[PDB]
Design a protein around this motif. Structure first.
Motif, PDB file in Angstrom:
ATOM      1  N   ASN A 173       0.793  -1.228   0.000  1.00 14.65           N
ATOM      2  CA  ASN A 173       0.000   0.000   0.000  1.00 14.65           C
ATOM      3  C   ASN A 173       0.824   1.276   0.000  1.00 14.65           C
ATOM      4  OD1 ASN A 173      -2.306  -1.582   0.012  1.00 14.65           O
ATOM      5  ND2 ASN A 173      -2.715  -1.312   2.203  1.00 14.65           N
ATOM      6  N   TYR A 174       2.145   1.127   0.060  1.00 12.79           N
ATOM      7  CA  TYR A 174       3.075   2.242   0.244  1.00 12.79           C
ATOM      8  C   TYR A 174       2.768   3.433  -0.668  1.00 12.79           C
ATOM      9  CZ  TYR A 174       7.663   4.579   0.873  1.00 12.79           C
ATOM     10  OH  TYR A 174       8.674   5.481   1.151  1.00 12.79           O
ATOM     11  N   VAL A 175       2.683   3.193  -1.978  1.00 10.01           N
ATOM     12  CA  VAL A 175       2.497   4.306  -2.925  1.00 10.01           C
ATOM     13  C   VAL A 175       1.107   4.967  -2.827  1.00 10.01           C
ATOM     14  CG1 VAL A 175       2.282   4.847  -5.416  1.00 10.01           C
ATOM     15  CG2 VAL A 175       4.331   3.734  -4.542  1.00 10.01           C
ATOM     16  N   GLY A 176       0.097   4.179  -2.484  1.00  8.87           N
ATOM     17  CA  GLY A 176      -1.243   4.735  -2.266  1.00  8.87           C
ATOM     18  C   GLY A 176      -1.248   5.708  -1.096  1.00  8.87           C
ATOM     19  N   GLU A 177      -0.534   5.348  -0.031  1.00  7.33           N
ATOM     20  CA  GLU A 177      -0.445   6.198   1.159  1.00  7.33           C
ATOM     21  C   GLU A 177       0.415   7.426   0.926  1.00  7.33           C
ATOM     22  OE1 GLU A 177      -2.440   5.386   3.969  1.00  7.33           O
ATOM     23  OE2 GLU A 177      -3.148   4.213   2.257  1.00  7.33           O
ATOM     24  N   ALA A 178       1.566   7.226   0.295  1.00  9.02           N
ATOM     25  CA  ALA A 178       2.496   8.310   0.079  1.00  9.02           C
ATOM     26  C   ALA A 178       2.071   9.284  -1.011  1.00  9.02           C
ATOM     27  CB  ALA A 178       3.887   7.763  -0.227  1.00  9.02           C
ATOM     28  N   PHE A 179       1.552   8.771  -2.128  1.00  8.96           N
ATOM     29  CA  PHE A 179       1.393   9.586  -3.335  1.00  8.96           C
ATOM     30  C   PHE A 179       0.033   9.445  -4.003  1.00  8.96           C
ATOM     31  CE2 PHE A 179       6.031   8.649  -3.048  1.00  8.96           C
ATOM     32  CZ  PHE A 179       6.433   9.935  -2.749  1.00  8.96           C
ATOM     33  N   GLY A 180      -0.976   9.025  -3.243  1.00  6.41           N
ATOM     34  CA  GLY A 180      -2.302   8.792  -3.807  1.00  6.41           C
ATOM     35  C   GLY A 180      -2.881   9.979  -4.553  1.00  6.41           C
ATOM     36  N   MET A 215       3.186   0.398  -6.495  1.00  9.65           N
ATOM     37  CA  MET A 215       2.320   1.058  -7.456  1.00  9.65           C
ATOM     38  C   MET A 215       1.706   0.029  -8.418  1.00  9.65           C
ATOM     39  SD  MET A 215       2.998   4.254  -9.952  1.00  9.65           S
ATOM     40  CE  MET A 215       1.770   4.727 -11.186  1.00  9.65           C
ATOM     41  N   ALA A 216       2.517  -0.930  -8.863  1.00  6.08           N
ATOM     42  CA  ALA A 216       2.010  -1.968  -9.751  1.00  6.08           C
ATOM     43  C   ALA A 216       0.880  -2.749  -9.072  1.00  6.08           C
ATOM     44  CB  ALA A 216       3.135  -2.901 -10.193  1.00  6.08           C
ATOM     45  N   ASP A 217       1.085  -3.144  -7.813  1.00  6.53           N
ATOM     46  CA  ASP A 217       0.034  -3.839  -7.053  1.00  6.53           C
ATOM     47  C   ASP A 217      -1.274  -3.050  -6.966  1.00  6.53           C
ATOM     48  OD1 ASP A 217       1.075  -6.367  -6.407  1.00  6.53           O
ATOM     49  OD2 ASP A 217       2.039  -5.602  -4.579  1.00  6.53           O
ATOM     50  N   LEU A 218      -1.166  -1.726  -6.866  1.00  2.00           N
ATOM     51  CA  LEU A 218      -2.334  -0.856  -6.664  1.00  2.00           C
ATOM     52  C   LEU A 218      -2.958  -0.363  -7.963  1.00  2.00           C
ATOM     53  CD1 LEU A 218      -0.891   1.293  -3.751  1.00  2.00           C
ATOM     54  CD2 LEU A 218      -2.620  -0.531  -3.540  1.00  2.00           C
ATOM     55  N   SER A 219      -2.257  -0.582  -9.070  1.00  2.00           N
ATOM     56  CA  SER A 219      -2.632   0.023 -10.346  1.00  2.00           C
ATOM     57  C   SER A 219      -3.910  -0.537 -10.951  1.00  2.00           C
ATOM     58  CB  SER A 219      -1.483  -0.075 -11.343  1.00  2.00           C
ATOM     59  OG  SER A 219      -1.259  -1.403 -11.769  1.00  2.00           O
ATOM     60  N   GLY A 220      -4.272  -1.755 -10.562  1.00  2.00           N
ATOM     61  CA  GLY A 220      -5.517  -2.348 -11.052  1.00  2.00           C
ATOM     62  C   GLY A 220      -6.766  -1.767 -10.418  1.00  2.00           C
ATOM     63  N   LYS A 222      -6.662   1.441  -8.100  1.00  2.00           N
ATOM     64  CA  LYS A 222      -6.607   2.869  -7.785  1.00  2.00           C
ATOM     65  C   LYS A 222      -6.428   3.696  -9.056  1.00  2.00           C
ATOM     66  CE  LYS A 222      -5.005   2.580  -3.022  1.00  2.00           C
ATOM     67  NZ  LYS A 222      -6.395   2.877  -2.564  1.00  2.00           N
ATOM     68  N   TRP A 223      -6.653   5.008  -8.958  1.00  2.00           N
ATOM     69  CA  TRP A 223      -6.463   5.936 -10.082  1.00  2.00           C
ATOM     70  C   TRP A 223      -7.263   5.493 -11.306  1.00  2.00           C
ATOM     71  CZ3 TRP A 223      -1.832   3.624  -7.925  1.00  2.00           C
ATOM     72  CH2 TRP A 223      -1.432   4.276  -6.743  1.00  2.00           C
ATOM     73  N   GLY A 224      -8.440   4.911 -11.045  1.00  2.00           N
ATOM     74  CA  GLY A 224      -9.346   4.475 -12.106  1.00  2.00           C
ATOM     75  C   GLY A 224      -8.750   3.418 -13.026  1.00  2.00           C
ATOM     76  N   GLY A 225      -7.681   2.767 -12.570  1.00  2.00           N
ATOM     77  CA  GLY A 225      -6.995   1.766 -13.368  1.00  2.00           C
ATOM     78  C   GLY A 225      -6.129   2.345 -14.469  1.00  2.00           C
ATOM     79  N   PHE A 226      -5.936   3.665 -14.452  1.00  2.00           N
ATOM     80  CA  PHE A 226      -5.184   4.362 -15.498  1.00  2.00           C
ATOM     81  C   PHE A 226      -3.788   3.785 -15.699  1.00  2.00           C
ATOM     82  CE2 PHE A 226      -2.402   7.725 -17.141  1.00  2.00           C
ATOM     83  CZ  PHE A 226      -3.122   8.147 -18.264  1.00  2.00           C
ATOM     84  N   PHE A 227      -3.122   3.440 -14.596  1.00  2.00           N
ATOM     85  CA  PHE A 227      -1.742   2.959 -14.652  1.00  2.00           C
ATOM     86  C   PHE A 227      -1.614   1.437 -14.771  1.00  2.00           C
ATOM     87  CE2 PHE A 227      -1.583   6.933 -12.088  1.00  2.00           C
ATOM     88  CZ  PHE A 227      -0.746   7.690 -12.893  1.00  2.00           C
ATOM     89  N   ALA A 228      -2.728   0.736 -14.971  1.00  2.00           N
ATOM     90  CA  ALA A 228      -2.659  -0.726 -15.059  1.00  2.00           C
ATOM     91  C   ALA A 228      -1.734  -1.221 -16.166  1.00  2.00           C
ATOM     92  CB  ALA A 228      -4.055  -1.324 -15.236  1.00  2.00           C
ATOM     93  N   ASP A 229      -1.660  -0.461 -17.267  1.00  2.00           N
ATOM     94  CA  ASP A 229      -0.852  -0.823 -18.439  1.00  2.00           C
ATOM     95  C   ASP A 229       0.441  -0.030 -18.503  1.00  2.00           C
ATOM     96  OD1 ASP A 229      -2.770  -2.673 -19.275  1.00  2.00           O
ATOM     97  OD2 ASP A 229      -3.629  -1.332 -20.795  1.00  2.00           O
ATOM     98  N   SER A 230       0.819   0.609 -17.399  1.00  2.00           N
ATOM     99  CA  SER A 230       2.089   1.331 -17.365  1.00  2.00           C
ATOM    100  C   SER A 230       3.294   0.378 -17.303  1.00  2.00           C
ATOM    101  CB  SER A 230       2.107   2.332 -16.204  1.00  2.00           C
ATOM    102  OG  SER A 230       1.068   3.293 -16.370  1.00  2.00           O
ATOM    103  N   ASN A 231       4.484   0.953 -17.472  1.00  2.00           N
ATOM    104  CA  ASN A 231       5.723   0.177 -17.569  1.00  2.00           C
ATOM    105  C   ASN A 231       6.488   0.284 -16.268  1.00  2.00           C
ATOM    106  OD1 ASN A 231       5.373  -0.374 -20.494  1.00  2.00           O
ATOM    107  ND2 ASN A 231       5.394   1.866 -20.489  1.00  2.00           N
TER     108      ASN A 231
END
Ligand SMILES: [Ca+2]
Ligand SMILES: [Ca+2]
Ligand SMILES: [Ca+2]
Ligand SMILES: [Ca+2]
Ligand SMILES: [Ca+2]
Ligand SMILES: [Ca+2]
Ligand SMILES: [Ca+2]
Ligand SMILES: [Ca+2]
Ligand SMILES: [Ca+2]
Ligand SMILES: [Ca+2]
Ligand SMILES: [Zn+2]
Ligand SMILES: [Zn+2]
Length: 616
Positions: A173-180, A215-220, A222-231
């Motif tokens: 959850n680190y990135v959700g807490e730090a940079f949500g 961030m990868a764990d949360l990408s599916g 959070k942020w509307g799934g926008f980063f799900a296909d990020s690198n």
């Protein structure tokens, strides 16, 4: 390639990797620059100060000297210029519509209690017309309040940190807490510029690598799934996400890298933790002064012992792994290839052989790649199959046997055979390849090696005993007026040739074009080269050698006493045998290596033995 990512090609994956490394180095702002330079000049005699470990874990404040840590006064400008050279410029809070804090460097900070010292760089890459094309997110993770890092012994601090990453989904959850919230602003900014998730690159090292996995764990979700296909490319992460999205890159001997199983603390976390992991590059060795040293390795390998952190430092990640990117062998590698990176200090480089010691690691499997430095290296290959690259500088190579490719690169390079010239055969195709065959039949293909050193138990020619240096020339190996002749050969052209072996046996060098190589009753060595070559044994105990993009070849008359040698070819996973590459097409066995193939005409696959088909 070792850094292949998703379904990106070899080349696109390399470009992504190079950008990930660049933004990751930037996130540290040259923290280890002075230290790395001291190490490079002097070695590791004085070890590693705890202050450097606490700086890596907790962050700093900021640009200047910390005890133990030499400070390059130009650290900041050097780092910014380097990230700009790589195509990246920090994006301002104003551009993102971000209401929060940025510092003098433009660094963004964590948002919630427990994370307020966590850092991230948000960078943009632009086309020549100034349109945003890519966004880079480089996490500089921190452990929590700096002040906690000196309340116990450094070992106890590290141990406690590792144990706390897993419970209650802390790491996840680190990135959700730090940079949500910041990441919501990044989504809006991306969309305003016509970018989608696939246009975002996420990287970071150490606890920044932990952040990438988070961030990868949360990408599916959070942020509307926008980063799900990020690198997502993470360096030296102690953790691995539960997704299939993160390329976890690290040195095998970096004690932080893969310290946790997912985020779970195990009995191996504070020892050697080298079990294979699907997301991770498991066998890249940093051959540095610590790894090479008997003295440094007296104590059991552990993340709790500060000197081991030499292999965690980011400058050697950037320098070493860029040399992997640049390697002429890069396209031969895969995620779990054994790759030994020459990372010695200047004093140690002078007298230490870079080699696979297999220290503090599970037994290495498959071929071995050894990547030199741009200075004078001593490189030692093992008794298995090796790919040795000297790069610039005057390099000296040794090798213990098997089938090898040895690339001298720029400079005056030497192959030291450590045995009599009389135990070797030498051939030369006139196209820059010198072939060296040992008494057991192992072949090294060499380029840019102008000197061969042999060790003579008697007086060679009645003249020279002990170490003898031979010059590699068009007419053979020369010592003054004495010549060791190349093996009998027939050389073609870069067009289509028919070449005929003599009865005594010949090396047949087809070179480019679709060649017709007619062996004789003698023992021939067939090198079809580029193009689609038809190669006929003619009898005897023949060798067929395949290297590089060797084309679609047909081999006629192959029998049990003949040998195929695949060396420096595509599609070879560590420890592959011929069956992994074989099929029947009608009455013929076909062996495929990437887009290249060998058809064994009229040979049933069940008649073949691994001993007759060398896969290096
Ligand atoms: Ca792996
Ligand atoms: Ca390993
Ligand atoms: Ca070199
Ligand atoms: Ca060289
Ligand atoms: Ca070898
Ligand atoms: Ca030809
Ligand atoms: Ca050819
Ligand atoms: Ca023959
Ligand atoms: Ca035969
Ligand atoms: Ca060919
Ligand atoms: Zn444009
Ligand atoms: Zn023919």
């Amino acid at each position: 390639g070792v850094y292949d990512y998703k379904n990106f090609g070899t080349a696109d994956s390399k470009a992504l990797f190079s950008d990930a490394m660049a933004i990751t180095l930037y996130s540290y702002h040259n923290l280890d620059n002075g230290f790395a330079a001291g190490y490079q000049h002097n070695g590791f005699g004085l070890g590693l100060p705890a202050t450097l470990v606490t700086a890596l874990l907790g962050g700093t404040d900021s640009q200047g000297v910390i005890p133990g840590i030499p400070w390059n006064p130009d650290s900041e400008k050097l780092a910014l210029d380097a990230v700009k050279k790589a195509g990246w410029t920090p994006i301002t809070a104003s551009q993102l519509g971000y209401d929060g804090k940025t510092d003098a460097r433009g660094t963004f900070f964590g948002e919630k209690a427990g994370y307020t010292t966590a850092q991230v760089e948000i960078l943009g890459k632009y086309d020549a017309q100034g349109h945003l094309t890519e966004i880079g997110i480089a996490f500089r993770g921190t452990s929590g309040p700096r002040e906690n890092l000196i309340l116990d012994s450094i070992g106890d601090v590290i141990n406690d940190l590792l144990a706390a990453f897993g419970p209650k989904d802390y790491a996840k959850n680190y990135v959700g807490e730090a940079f949500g919230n910041l990441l919501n602003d990044v989504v809006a900014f991306a969309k305003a510029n016509g970018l989608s998730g696939k246009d975002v690159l996420v990287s970071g090292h150490s606890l920044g690598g932990l952040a990438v996995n988070s961030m990868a764990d949360l990408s599916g979700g959070k942020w509307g799934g926008f980063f799900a296909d990020s690198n997502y490319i993470a360096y030296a992460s102690p953790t691995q996400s539960s997704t299939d999205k993160v390329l976890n890159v690290g040195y095998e001997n970096d004690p932080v890298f893969r310290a946790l199983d997912g985020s779970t603390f195990t009995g191996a976390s504070v020892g050697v933790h080298d079990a294979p992991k699907e997301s991770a590059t498991d066998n890249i060795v940093s051959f540095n002064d610590h790894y090479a040293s008997t003295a440094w390795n007296l104590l059991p390998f552990s993340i709790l012992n500060i000197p081991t952190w030499i292999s965690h430092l980011p400058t050697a990640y950037g320098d070493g792994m860029n040399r992997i990117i640049e390697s002429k062998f890069y396209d031969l590698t895969s995620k779990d290839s054994t790759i030994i990176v020459a990372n010695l200090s200047d004093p140690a480089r002078a007298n230490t052989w870079v080699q696979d010691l297999n220290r503090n690691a599970e037994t290495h499997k498959g071929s071995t790649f050894i990547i030199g430095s741009d200075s004078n290296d001593l490189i030692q290959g093992g008794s298995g199959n090796d790919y040795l690259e000297g790069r610039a500088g005057n390099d000296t190579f040794r090798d213990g046997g098997g089938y090898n490719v040895i690339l001298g690169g720029a400079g005056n390079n030497t192959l030291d055979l450590q045995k009599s010239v009389n135990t070797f055969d030498f051939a030369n195709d006139g196209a820059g390849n010198l072939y060296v065959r040992d008494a057991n039949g192992g072949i090294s293909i060499t380029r840019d090696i102008g000197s061969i050193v042999t060790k003579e138990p008697g007086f060679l020619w009645g003249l020279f005993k002990d170490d003898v240096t031979h010059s590699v020339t068009a007419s053979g190996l020369k010592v003054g007026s004495n010549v060791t002749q190349y093996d009998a050969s027939v050389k073609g052209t870069n067009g289509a040739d028919t070449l005929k072996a003599h009865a005594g046996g010949d090396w047949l060098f087809g070179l480019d074009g679709n060649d017709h190589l007619i062996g004789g009753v003698g023992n021939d060595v067939f090198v079809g080269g580029a193009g689609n070559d038809l190669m006929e044994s003619g009898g005897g105990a023949d060798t067929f050698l395949f290297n590089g993009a060797f084309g679609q070849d047909r081999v006629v008359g192959f029998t049990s006493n003949d040998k195929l040698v695949f060396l420096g070819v595509q599609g070879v996973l560590p420890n592959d045998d011929f069956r992994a590459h074989a099929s029947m097409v009608g009455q013929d066995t076909v062996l495929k290596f990437g887009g290249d193939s060998v058809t064994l005409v009229g040979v049933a696959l069940n008649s073949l033995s691994a001993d007759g088909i060398v896969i290096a």
